[PDB]
Amino acid sequence: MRDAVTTLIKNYDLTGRYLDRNAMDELKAYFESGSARIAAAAMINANSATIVKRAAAQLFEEIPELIRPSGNAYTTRRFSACLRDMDYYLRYASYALIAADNNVLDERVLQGLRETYNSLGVPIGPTVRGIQIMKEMIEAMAEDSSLNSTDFIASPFDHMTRELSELSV
Amino acid sequence: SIVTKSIVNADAEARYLSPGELDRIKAFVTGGAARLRIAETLTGSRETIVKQAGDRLFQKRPDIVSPGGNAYGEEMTATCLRDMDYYLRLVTYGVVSGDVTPIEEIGLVGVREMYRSLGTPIEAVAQSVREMKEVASGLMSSDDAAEASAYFDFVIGKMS
Amino acid sequence: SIVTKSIVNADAEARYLSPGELDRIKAFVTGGAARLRIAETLTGSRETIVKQAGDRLFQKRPDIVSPGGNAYGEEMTATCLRDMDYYLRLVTYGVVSGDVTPIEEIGLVGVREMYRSLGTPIEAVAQSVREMKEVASGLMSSDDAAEASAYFDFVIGKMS
Amino acid sequence: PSQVAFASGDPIPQNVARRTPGPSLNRFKEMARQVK
Amino acid sequence: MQDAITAVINSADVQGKYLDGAAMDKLKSYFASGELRVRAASVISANAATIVKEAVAKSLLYSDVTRPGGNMYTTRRYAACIRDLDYYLRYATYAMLAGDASILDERVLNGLKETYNSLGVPISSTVQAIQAIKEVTASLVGADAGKEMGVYLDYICSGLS
Amino acid sequence: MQDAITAVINSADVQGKYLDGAAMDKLKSYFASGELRVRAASVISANAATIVKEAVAKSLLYSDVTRPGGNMYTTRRYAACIRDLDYYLRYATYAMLAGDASILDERVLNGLKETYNSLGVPISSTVQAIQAIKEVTASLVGADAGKEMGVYLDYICSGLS
């Protein structure tokens, strides 16, 4: 796992360089965003269960076939597994928000994810849509609350969305 | 998009983007507000655009909704309107990107094979895109009507 | 052979051969003329050993070649002698190698399952190897006879 | 004795229905109900 | 390849969605950056050869790499190396214009490590040369455009790690 | 694995024949070379660390691979390369003692090229380091046993290619 500081250090060590002005500026940006990142993670912790439940409900309202026969959320077994997967995505998105780096998603969520869903027949597209639903809910929550910085919030979710979804163009 | 198409053209020739290509990208990026407005107008009227275009389609080709036609019954007609919705959405994609590549990659490469497999008369889909084009041009000014009509005609010409 | 045995043992421990193992290999390498001589004796008298041993065996255990026995018939008796010849050949391999590993790997791993499937009584095969051992020892000096009898009795003990 | 035949017996074809537009087309279905 | 606009288009398409407010916002941000990107691309294109020349003089010339036994020794190898630097500069300019590194993943870094290892090309030396290109390009195109171009050249460098 | 003795035995067994004159000649040749093999193996075991040390100093130190961005940069990667050379020397010694390269295919080469490709380890540099090992060992062990060791080190090199 690599966070923003580790990513920067790796970049500079690759060339055997001491940290210069640009490195110090990037580290300063991360450190000043740290409070907002911590607040966003705490807000997610305060609402994770309801976020997951509401996002799943919205997804099954948008794609009702999922909870109907032959849908991959059909039956309580598959429904529970789906809510479990949504919980996974939210927890690792919170990790990525704190780290200001999406490598945690790459290492522990995305690598081999397409293979697993293909093996099980889990449909990728609805999962990506559910990720986006949770992202929108988090963004609205952050806007409602007394949080100053909320632009970083989208970064992990979008990353997962780009990494897992099929390439159309 | 315009950017990726210009890059691909330049790279095929192993050269930097030409001054003319750079000028075209600059003009596109400066005019972005108009294209975003056009996309918003097409998106907002999507239901009425699809509905009126489908009405005109089933008037010009009643056969597809007559028994023995591909779009016979509420289900098949509904799926036809859904397909019209896809092609309108791709039209918006092509408008905002300033290039036909999104439309082509999403809904033209191998479209003949798909609708041949489904027993769908591809000419009727081209005519439906014509109907949507007319309805859309009836909801916007002449300049932006032409701006959208370029991509509408692209879809029609590729499906015929 | 001791070379492969020591190399495998060292490899499993990710180490070079110890000086003791290298000296063992040295001694084995030096003392090879006697082994090759015993093997040359055995291979020279192959058919005689097999025929005499088979005669003694079928005299001793007529039920093997009487009605209902596994070796009853012209083809069955020939096959039984063929097996005797196999095991003599393996014994010569063991003598030359100075080790029982070629014998075990070629003709003792799973031998019980094979002969159980074929219906052959394994103890009678052990008796056959005993007869071959006696015949072979009859044609050699005492030291050479004992050295060859070591491998013969290894086979006998593993087959019964 | 012949009753043992299940995989070796005459196959019994099962009914599998052609899939049809699900609820995700509901809006268009309404549009289809208002296009006649 | 996939630029900012195309990335937005893909995100919307895979959900069967029309572009919403956030997507239009991303498009508008890319449009805002477009002028700077075009200016930097024009300047670099005009000065690619001299950028490479100065980077080579900074990092490669008068070292063991160009002496007999070095990987830049002989005219064919020297020409190949400056050609590679031309490649990296041009494709970094492409990525900067697109605002996306995907072109680098698709036709720059794919199998590049194997290529250089099979050829015997030294990885550390080329990384230092690309760093020199980043520095020269920054000194030519100013701090902000140098930061962006450096993002993409450093992407290439991290690929070679 | 097979050694020379087991190799000749198995070549006889696959045809179901006893050991004839030619096979006995092969066995005699191996028994005649066993003393030299054992002495060379003892010498190599005594100086294994020194052999790898001198080969590395001869081939890889003060070059691209050890500088930032080179595959041997960082202490972990340096140590990994050293112990890969240790592997190759130990297994070449095994094969020389056995007079057969079967162990090399079984416990060195089967899947090593793919592993190195996945890790980005340079193969040509590895071959040059192994050749340095061959030269150092030959200078330590003698010309003939050095040639025998060179056979199996070159076997490893060819397997890597």
Added chain:
Amino acid sequence: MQDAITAVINSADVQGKYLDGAAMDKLKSYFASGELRVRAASVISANAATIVKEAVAKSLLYSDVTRPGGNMYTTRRYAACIRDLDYYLRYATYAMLAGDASILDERVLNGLKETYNSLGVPISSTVQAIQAIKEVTASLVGADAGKEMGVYLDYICSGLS
């Protein structure tokens, strides 16, 4: 590929050196051997088909290899095998003329072992056929050119085992 002259030149050029006394001595020795090499190569070109014929008759015919179930069984596989022997003889003659085995590694032995393993071609039988070619060539061309041809045929054998 490199011949003896090109090998000398490459070592010198990699040092950046003019050709000193030792390099000129190597060149002189190769020039001295040139006439013998050319005579031997002419003889082999004259008798290539006979050399292959006699090596096959010595090593492969009237064995399980040619009988049903062996790899040389069927006229197609027979033709493929004798074609391969012709290839090996031609490339050994090339190497002898050049005084360098490099052409064997670049043109013959590259991926050959993997080829024969994927085809199920028996390697020991091929090696025996090549050694029979060596003996026939020795009896035909002499004991000096025979020795050089033996060096290069044994090189081919070394890359197959």
Added chain:
Amino acid sequence: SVKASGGSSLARPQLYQTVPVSAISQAEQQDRFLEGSELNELTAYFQSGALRLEIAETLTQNADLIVSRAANRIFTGGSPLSYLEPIPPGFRPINIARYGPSNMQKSLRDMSWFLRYTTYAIVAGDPNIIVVNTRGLKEVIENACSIDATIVAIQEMRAASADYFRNNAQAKEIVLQYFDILLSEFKAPTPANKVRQGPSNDIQGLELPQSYFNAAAKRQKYAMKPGLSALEKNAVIKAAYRQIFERDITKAYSQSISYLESQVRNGDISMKEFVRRLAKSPLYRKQFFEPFINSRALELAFRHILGRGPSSREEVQKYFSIVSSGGLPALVDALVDSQEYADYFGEETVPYLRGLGVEAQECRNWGMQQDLFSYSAPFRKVPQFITTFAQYDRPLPDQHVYGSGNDPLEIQFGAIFPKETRNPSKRPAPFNKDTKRILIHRGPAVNNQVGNPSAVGEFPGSLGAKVFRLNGGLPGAGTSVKFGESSTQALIRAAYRQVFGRDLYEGQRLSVAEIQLENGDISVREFIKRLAKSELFLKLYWAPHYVCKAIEYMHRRLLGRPTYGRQEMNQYFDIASKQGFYAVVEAMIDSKEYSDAFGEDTVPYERYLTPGGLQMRSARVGSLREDIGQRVDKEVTPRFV
């Protein structure tokens, strides 16, 4: 995007348990024929089948009435049946208008679904489907559905369903028992998820819903205890051998270590110590250490000792270090003494393959663990976990877009591809439609058409292959000793060597094409087209191969280079789909790049190589240059001389 793939094989978790599956898996997991126990279960189940199908028939026929009775008891103020898709103290009927159409639809659907799955469970002879899909449904629907109302509806359905079975206490008891299970399971609270915590900081923590575990096939667990009967101890030891050695080598080959078995069955050693000593044994050494490089041996050892494959790059790194240091004993000791081993198996339990259904699975090693758990794992020699884990962290490899198996050897002649099943070595990587493969020019580097697209056709001189051209005039364009016979024939044989790799046997050459070329009637391009389309080429190089392998080899022979990526591959493959082999050949030889590189008078030739091919050619000891990949020290005479 992701840079590597561990492979993806079809996964078939068990949705629910049925009697035949239960019995047959009970026999099959123990590697034996069905015995009297399982066969008797099968007999009893098959005998009951007629009655069970009668129950199912009567319930499906009258499902409408049963659901209607439930809906009428549960709902008030309207007709619930307007749209169809003992009493708890808190029960109160629900108003149709207030409750809403969507929730009414879900109520009716759920009642019918309960009855349907009850009939399914009756037929299957096991309530496992009901338990699986009903334990924890309450908490799923508490907040929009009345639990008392659902209970009353299920009670009404139970009564109505059992009302049709006054026959005797055979049909009625089964229906009542399955409905009672449904009722008690709907009343059940949600059980906690099974947590699989990360054993270290390099492995993530996971959890699995208990319903997922309940559906999947249960892993039989063997534990050695002192009090077990002798037969049970025998079964446990056989399980230990099946785990460690991947099959019962004692049954197959009489291979066994008797003193270890006596010690473990006496309790002198624990099952953990037995596993440690068995995995160190020369039997295990010969079977799963000697045949493998250490990198693959450690992966197999993880399978055998922990029941799982490596989980991360750090883990394979650590354990490869351990095996490099202390070999097989160190590896076995580290695995067996790990906190993870004791956490799962303790001292008594035989290790078991965990995998899907037994606990939450990770995505990162999904395909690799699927492969590892197969009984064919011993025949993969190439490491799969270190390779894939390393490739995650690095850009895309030099590899055909459809996989490593689609890359032939770059040899003079022959189409040699790795066979997918023979010594499995597959290395899938996600190349999208737009990647371009980096190729090495056979010639001056600066003439590579990527950087110098107008260099196409520039002959490579001494740095590249020989090029055959019909530059000289053709004969008869009478007299003997016309010199134009040697050049044209050399070109004809060169074209044969190019299209087929080597010269053909006598009688195989397309003589008509040769004379028609020698008479100026066609061009060199036309002749090579005839050669490529020849039935001989079809039989040799098209027919025996995977379609894309055939296309790739064709491209290399005709265009002198591998394909760049999915664009070329897809177009030729699509032509193969639509038209066939001759049309593919036409497309390759009529392409623009052929014309640019080769005119109407140039025999094609090798123009490019993959990195792998060049390395094969130029990395051997006899061809490796002295300056490549090493420091070249200048030698100078010592100053004291």
